[PDB]
Symmetry: D2
Subunit: 255 residues, 4 copies
């Protein structure tokens, strides 16, 4: 059965502007009967990579088809070039993800239980995914970084088209040991006894970020944090993220 | 204060196809606070005229600015050339409006109280408005036909671009005494002692439907059904419907 | 290779209403250099099946990614339940496709050469594809029906959700030998020595329309009209059409 | 009469990401006749204020209705909190407006003649308008700042929600005498004998920026640059910009 594709534009109090957001809302019989209470849906926060935006998962994948198969609501915000940080010179986009989460859970029929909420994303969005997994573990039961950047000191110094490192991190000499460093966040999560979401980490074998992914899961192993790592043929493109997100969605909802 | 402009497309079980719908959802503080019970908004079902669709109130008026000012949610469906009827040869568009009503009240924080729900529309949508007011009086406390057609035979017999009367009414030589006839609907509603929503009827003095509007309120007068009628300069265009929907929205939300 | 995803809503003189249309416009370097002449793009008219609309190819396939890879503009109109006919009781939707063709070729940088123009669609849209291929053979060098209905008496008698046979064909007892019949259109095209676009016909072997497809290509063979027929595992769904439109796009832009 | 409302999302080589853009394209009989030469439309570049985006003129005004009346195409980009600058730490948003201009004039039937091209915008967009007027005078015959900031040091030190002064201007303490200072851009344009577009400057008399506007036009008078200034009741809101843009469009298209 099909569902709703929703484009929302609202003025965000956190980032001080109108901003577009897309939502996939699978249909439920209770949505068409006024006398019943809506059945709240499992919900996936889905984070785009660098140069993508709120439309690009819809356009370059079949995610809505996959989400419909599994009665999974999907939230796709736009965070520009922010790497999901509260920027030194820019917008508070880390806070924005938390606002979007609260907003769509207030207005749409989405379950608020931790077991029903997941987060995922690719490249910059996998980096975002792991940051939220390690700082908001109470909000998500599972997190799926796809082709993620785990060594951030390779992302800040990437000279991508119109990308500004300083807008994110200011005049910081190095991200190592800071809240921009997934390894620091991971050590801090373990040290503070925070719940870590269940981890499915995916990366194509031909991706430049592959060795970076191997390094991170090696570290997870050495600090006895469980994870599932899935590799196979694939590069750093939406042809890969199309197939990976289909697999990730099956894994999220089936526990 | 601002709010959310929302474009939705879902596969409707009533009309058997994907269909676009737009929704204005003004901001409430509870929408951004996870620990607050969402406070349901007053809701207007707003019906386009012939040749218009779910986008044209946004485009040709400032309706979102007026609705935000009064924290009024606005639902703008698309019903094509159907005159809001379950068509003889076409779609079940009367049933569709009821589906849309139920659907948005389930998936959005919209009040289900009769006193909080209103309906309005212009030309063919004023005709639609009076039909739902006289057959669904339980669902709406107030109804605002703008530049409406009350004598339905004029709309059926109209020579308009690509418009099909038979699509709506099939073989019927006249609409009088049928569910397509607002005068019969009004007689039936008075005969069955149904609730009739409070009526604000508006039409510009230069509108070609102005005499048709005079005829209807004369009849309302004659059978002692209460209403308010507002005329003044104006023609059958969105310049007038912009000004009229602004007045109409203020009227709905204030008791 | 990225491109533009475009939603257009304009008032159609042919069907007498505002209507949504979507357009994929792959990027060309001449689009960003004002000193260069626009190089017009090859263009595909892509027709949805019954219950789909202008949004559902973007939503349920990765078509924009395939089209970008091959610099192919894609035009995706909405024709409701019309089976791409000028309906007996409804809209002039056959003429509408011709207006859309003219409109987008006037306002966008699209090649007007027959060799650069293709048409394709699935189910009801495969039926529409073969109808336009056999009546507008001068406008398209290639045509691709996917999982199409060739024996039109089956679409007409289908008891699909809210679908109206009479809206399309009126009180015709049978479509055989009329303009609604692809076999009549095919006999007529051959007898009048019209150009028949190169045909690539695709259908999954588990599709209940498979035999219908086998019957039509058998007839093509018996009257010496060339075609390419590709079958294989696949059912009547967007998982199949996603795969098939990717292969169809590659076939149409190469020679 | 009618026209097309267009939403475009393309990956911009200038700002290195997908970005949404809105276009109003009034209808012309040449757009529907494959046999006639497209007559290019007069074109307005319309710039939003701080916290608005590419949707908010459509939502909060009836601009499409006014543009249609005058066969004026309208281009409405999104530039976030950039103040139309190539940001010190952020995106190349000044260059982005030049890209948008070139792109839409390549892919749409828009006049490339200076006399047919205009620019306008409110608050931060009136600031943008005067910056482009004084630096790209060959692109625009007419410019209309609405409720503009002309003394930029106040927009920079405004502590609007989530707004970053340093993102735009870097470590700079003052904007005076830089590319961010309309008075310096004005002095330069005069000293270099550049074409200055015809200026229509509008501001409500209850606006915070009224005095700032009086200061600017006083300086224009003292350096023999012509302008028309229109004030009258009005504050700093879309109620004013709706009425003002309606009059601005009339003034633009009439010679
Ligand atoms: C992540 O979003 N990545 C997108 C494009 C490919 C590489 C880029 C990245 C590379 C190296 C380090 C960090 C990010
Ligand atoms: C209203 O929506 N109708 C469509 C075209 C313009 C007014 C028209 C109408 C006129 C007279 C009688 C019935 C309908
Ligand atoms: C195609 O668009 N048609 C709509 C629903 C599924 C296939 C269906 C069709 C089936 C059989 C005969 C004709 C049409
Ligand atoms: C204009 O776009 N600016 C954004 C917020 C409100 C008005 C504001 C501004 C006011 C005064 C001086 C500079 C900027």
């Amino acid at each position: 059965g099909p569902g709703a594709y929703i484009s929302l534009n609202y003025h965000s109090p956190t980032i001080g502007m109108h901003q577009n957001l897309t939502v996939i809302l699978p249909e439920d019989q209770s949505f068409f009967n006024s006398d019943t209470t809506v059945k709240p849906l499992k919900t996936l926060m889905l984070l785009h990579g660098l140069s993508s935006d709120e439309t690009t998962y819809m356009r370059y994948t079949s995610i809505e088809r996959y989400a419909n198969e599994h009665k999974l609501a999907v939230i796709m915000p736009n965070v520009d070039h922010s790497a999901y940080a509260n920027m030194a010179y820019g917008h508070s986009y880390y806070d924005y993800i938390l606002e979007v989460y609260d907003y769509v859970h207030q207005i749409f029929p989405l379950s608020k239980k931790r077991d029903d909420n997941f987060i995922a994303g690719h490249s910059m969005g996998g980096y975002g995914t792991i940051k939220f997994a390690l700082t908001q573990g109470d909000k998500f039961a599972k997190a799926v970084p796809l082709s993620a950047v785990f060594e951030a000191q390779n992302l800040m110094d990437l000279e991508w088209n119109d990308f500004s490192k300083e807008a994110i991190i200011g005049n910081l000499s190095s991200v190592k040991g800071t809240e921009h460093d997934p390894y620091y966040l991971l050590d801090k999560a373990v040290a503070e006894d925070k719940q870590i979401p269940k981890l499915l980490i995916m990366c194509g074998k031909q991706d430049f970020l592959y060795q970076d992914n191997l390094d991170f899961i090696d570290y997870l192993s050495r600090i006895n944090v469980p994870y599932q790592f899935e590799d196979g043929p694939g590069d750093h493109d939406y042809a890969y993220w199309d197939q990976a997100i289909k697999r990730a969605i099956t894994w999220m909802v089936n526990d």
